[PDB]
């Protein structure tokens, strides 16, 4: 009958500079011979060809497909990806959402700490030097 595909992780949150691996799977009989990945954009969905910008990779086996995205960019990479598997009896699709965390949130306890140190130094340096 018709195939039923599902994502291993429906939503992921990786960070820039790394490489995300989204994977869809299916257990229908007959197995899914071909898989295709599309990136959702406003009013249109663009196919993800292997080797694009030397950073995309697609690895497909019977009923399972991995989408590797290297060097996570903050402008084009985050969003929704659609995997479509077409068995001899039909086709199905799954939706995976990917977010890219930046270094702003990653180096959060570094800026926080140095800011707090600065504030402390200003507080003590005005509370004593001129006020006291």
């Amino acid at each position: 009958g018709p195939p039923r595909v599902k994502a291993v992780k429906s939503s992921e949150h990786i960070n820039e500079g790394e490489t995300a691996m989204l994977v869809c799977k299916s257990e229908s009989v007959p197995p899914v011979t071909d898989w295709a990945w599309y990136k959702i954009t406003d009013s249109e969905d663009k196919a993800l060809m292997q080797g694009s910008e030397s950073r995309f990779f697609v690895s497909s086996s019977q009923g399972r497909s991995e989408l590797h995205i290297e060097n996570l960019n903050m402008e084009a990479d985050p969003g929704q990806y659609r995997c479509q598997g077409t068995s001899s009896k039909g086709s199905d699709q799954a939706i995976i959402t990917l977010r890219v965390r930046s270094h702003l949130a990653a180096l959060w306890p570094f800026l926080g700490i140095v800011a707090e140190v600065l504030v402390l130094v200003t507080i003590i340096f005005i509370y004593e030097k001129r006020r006291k």
Partner: antibody, heavy 112, light 112 residues
């Protein structure tokens, strides 16, 4: 769905050596193959992987020391310069979700 | 940079019928692509769990993988004598960049 390694033997340091893994019950164009080695009484070392499209990726510590290739039915792993520290059992494994199907393994000894 | 897996503890024991746990800690986010393997002495390893939680085909329910992110844990219950073997975890998250390095290993000794 099975595989079978061959080519394990004793060789002198420096002499190259090629191991062959013959698949059976599935095509090499629809599944990837991993090469994993294990020293006597030690853990498993992941060597490299060759995808269905043909791309080959090697471990950081193993860059240059090995070479993976494949034909329509077998995968070959060539060692360009084996050392004494290269004696281990080498397994080939079909990659679908982790390594499910594994081979019996062939033993490669490097000594004088 | 290849991801390194820190498997602890090295050894773990339990009586027949008990429950053991094994923890694997990844050097980086390998959120859900970790497989667990059971290798018996002499025989080749056999895949036990894929995607850190899905049970492999023809595997008993006694094995239960849990965890995500960088911390994973495998647990066995009703420890039979046929469970005495070494267990290994393995990351396979974006192998083309971080490899598929294996864990140190965990020898599970039953206490009869």
């Amino acid at each position: 769905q099975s595989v079978e390694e061959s080519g394990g033997r004793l060789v002198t340091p420096g002499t190259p050596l090629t191991l062959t893994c013959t698949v059976s019950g599935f095509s090499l164009s629809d599944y990837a193959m991993n090469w994993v080695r294990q020293a006597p009484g030690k853990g498993l070392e992941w060597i490299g992987i060759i995808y269905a499209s043909g791309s080959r990726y090697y471990a950081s510590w193993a860059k240059g020391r090995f070479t993976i290739s494949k034909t329509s039915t077998t995968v070959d792993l060539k060692i360009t310069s084996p050392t004494t520290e290269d004696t281990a059992t080498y397994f080939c494994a079909r990659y679908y979700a982790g390594s499910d199907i594994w081979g019996p393994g062939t033993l490669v000894t490097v000594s004088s | 940079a290849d991801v390194v897996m820190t498997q602890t503890p090295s050894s773990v024991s339990a009586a027949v019928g008990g429950t053991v746990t094994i923890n694997c800690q990844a050097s980086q986010s390998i959120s859900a692509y970790l497989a667990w393997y059971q290798q018996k002495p002499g025989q080749p390893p056999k895949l036990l769990i894929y995607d850190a939680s899905d049970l492999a085909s023809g595997v008993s329910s006694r094995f239960k993988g849990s965890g995500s992110g960088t911390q994973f844990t495998l647990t066995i219950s009703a420890l039979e004598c046929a469970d005495a073997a070494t267990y290994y975890c393995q990351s396979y998250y974006a192998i083309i960049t971080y490899g598929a390095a294996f864990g140190g290993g965990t020898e599970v000794v039953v206490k009869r």
